[PDB]
Design a protein around this ligand. Structure first.
Ligand SMILES: *[C@@H]1O[C@H](CO)[C@@H](O[C@@H]2O[C@H](CO)[C@@H](O)[C@H](O)[C@H]2NC(C)=O)[C@H](O)[C@H]1NC(C)=O
Ligand code: NAG
Ligand code: NAG
Lengths: 54, 50
């Protein structure tokens, strides 16, 4: 939703575009759009659901 | 200077214009052709019109 995805080699994080403040990928800080096939450069990864433990 | 993939940079400009990033990635091929075609057209217009 804001910022870009980054990876330190193993994990994946989303951080603001002007300061390295990584955090876990969550459905709140991202938004779904369409299917995986259309976009190029997409990578496999899981998105944590905040209400999943609930 | 901060390196960044050019299609990703477009998403920044698209996001900074009022459209979501997805509209670019879902149309990256179309936009690229339009950009190249426009770049070709301006060259001809400059060459033709004195
Ligand atoms: C990338 O960052 C992740 C953040 O989770 C690192 O994973 C942690 O690494 C520390 C040591 O740096 C461990 O103590 C933690 O247990 C790890 N946590 C998880 C959830 O994996 C990961 O090591 C980093 N990868 C790098 C730096 O290559
Ligand atoms: C260019 O980007 C594509 C799509 O992410 C990737 O498959 C390819 O390996 C890249 N080329 C490089 C990194 O030289
Ligand atoms: C997971 O991995 C491959 C290779 O990264 C990717 O192309 C694919 O779309 C992903 N999903 C599945 C179900 O294979």
């Amino acid at each position: 939703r804001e910022g870009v995805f980054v990876s330190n080699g193993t994990h994946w994080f989303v951080t603001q575009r002007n300061f390295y403040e990584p955090q876990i990928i969550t459905t709140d800080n991202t938004f779904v759009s369409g299917n995986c096939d259309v976009v190029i450069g997409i990578v496999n990864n899981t998105v944590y659901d905040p209400l999943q433990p609930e | 200077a901060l390196q960044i993939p050019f299609p990703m940079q477009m998403a920044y400009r698209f996001n900074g214009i009022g459209v979501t990033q997805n509209v670019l990635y879902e149309n990256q091929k179309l936009i690229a052709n339009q950009f190249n075609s426009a770049i070709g057209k301006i060259q001809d217009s400059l060459s033709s019109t004195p």
